[PDB]
C-alpha cells in the first residue's frame, strides 16, 4: 500500500517500555501480566534490552486486546484465522502489539490459543523481526503449540543482527 513506516525499524534505546491498555476476560489479569512478562523475558535474555511496564500511553509498545475493527485500520477476523498482529519499532503506532479477543486465550494445555506463545511471536515483530521461513522457528508465520523452548537459531540470529 501507500502506508510507510518511519525509521530503520529497530529500537535505539535499551529500556523498552510497555503499556497494557486493556485485558481479555479469558484469564486472570495477573496471569495475563505474567504471560506477557515471560514473553518479554525470552527476548531480554538474548538482547541488551530490558522491558519495563508503564501505566500511560507514553510507552514504546502499547498492548491491546481488540475485536474486528479496533482502531488501526487493520481489523481482526473473529474466531481463529488471524490471532494477533504487531508493528515494527519506531514512533506512534510503531512498536505496538494487538491480540484478537474473539479468540479464547489460554496458557499451555488450555483449550484455546497460548497467549504466551502468541505474545512471544508478536513481541518479536515489535522488536524488529520479520517472519521466518524456518518451520520450527518462533517467527514462522503459522501458530503451532509447543511445550519445548520457543526460540530457535534463526530467531536468535535475526535478533542479534538487530541488537548485537
Amino acid at each position: 500500500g501507500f502506508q510507510t513506516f518511519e525509521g530503520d525499524l529497530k529500537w535505539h534505546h535499551h529500556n523498552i517500555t510497555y503499556w497494557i491498555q486493556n485485558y481479555s476476560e479469558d484469564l486472570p489479569r495477573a496471569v495475563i501480566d505474567d504471560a506477557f512478562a515471560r514473553a518479554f523475558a525470552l527476548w531480554s535474555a538474548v538482547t541488551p534490552l530490558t522491558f519495563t511496564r508503564v501505566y500511560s500511553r507514553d510507552a514504546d509498545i502499547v498492548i491491546q486486546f481488540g475485536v474486528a475493527e479496533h482502531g488501526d485500520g487493520y481489523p481482526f477476523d473473529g474466531k481463529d484465522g488471524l490471532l494477533a498482529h504487531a508493528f515494527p519499532p519506531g514512533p506512534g503506532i510503531q512498536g505496538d502489539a494487538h491480540f484478537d479477543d474473539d479468540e479464547l486465550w489460554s496458557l499451555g494445555k488450555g483449550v484455546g490459543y497460548s497467549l504466551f506463545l502468541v505474545a512471544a511471536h508478536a513481541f518479536g515483530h515489535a522488536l524488529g523481526l520479520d517472519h521466518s521461513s524456518v518451520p520450527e522457528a518462533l517467527m514462522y508465520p503459522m501458530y503451532r503449540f509447543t511445550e519445548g523452548p520457543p526460540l530457535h537459531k534463526d530467531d536468535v540470529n535475526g535478533i542479534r543482527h538487530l541488537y548485537g
Binding site: 500500500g1 481463529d80 488471524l82 515494527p88 520479520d130 517472519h131 503459522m142 501458530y143
Partner: peptide, 8 residues
C-alpha cells in the same frame, strides 16, 4: 501494515 500471526 502490521505483520500477523495465523492459526491453521
Amino acid at each position: 501494515x502490521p505483520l500477523g500471526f495465523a492459526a491453521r
